[PDB]
């Protein structure tokens, strides 16, 4: 679980960084969808 929690924490910081970098809205969707996928496993 701790290994899976590490993935969610990291992916959640991925979508944050991309927001700070003012990346496109399309990219944010994809990465939020990744986080959603990971959260469903926890």
């Amino acid at each position: 679980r701790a290994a899976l929690e590490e993935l969610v924490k990291l992916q959640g910081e991925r979508v944050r960084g991309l927001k700070q970098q003012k990346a496109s809205a399309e990219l944010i969707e994809e990465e939020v969808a990744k986080l959603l996928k990971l959260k469903a496993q926890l």
Partner: antibody
Amino acid sequence: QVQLQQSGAELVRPGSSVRMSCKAVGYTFTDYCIGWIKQRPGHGLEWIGDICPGDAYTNDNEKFKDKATLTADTSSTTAYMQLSSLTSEDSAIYYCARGEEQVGLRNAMDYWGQGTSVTVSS
Amino acid sequence: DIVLTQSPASLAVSLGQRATISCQSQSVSTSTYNYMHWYQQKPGQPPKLLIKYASNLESGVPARFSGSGSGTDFTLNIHPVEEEDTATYYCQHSWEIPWTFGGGTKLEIKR
């Protein structure tokens, strides 16, 4: 209940600086960004900037670069906006509103404060 | 910045009839989501979110309100129109920084 509790109306002189507060309760403070919106007659609504508490960063509007400064205090779950070099054009009602989830999609602003009227006059 | 053009600027609709408010801009939609939102603001009150993501009705908001469209064109619909619906209606995008609002549409109830 989610509530955004803003500070009272302010009367301030031109050239001075003002600082208003936004107390947010009923939800996890660091999971959402908070938007600031300017409303004065004849200009509708205008987005000033977003504050994203926790590891605090801001989403900036270039038109408010040196005019507005957005900060936050996580412990008291309060967002602050400071308006400097005040002119008559800064006379408006200012709302804070809970925006997007920090790790979620781009979003609208659902929960709004009752607004803080700022009068710039001598 | 992204310009949101609303039409009409003001509108007068009779009781029980339909109100149609339009918002035009550049494409603020992906292939999955439409990042246009609708607000209602009555006098002396803060604006209230009606619709998010073009067509999702906020809980507590009457079914008389509805939204549609994608990409460059979005429409707000009110049917049937009631006396308490007199207000200014705004569209807003959450596509890219900065977020901007439409000019607003002042809805008058006709009697």
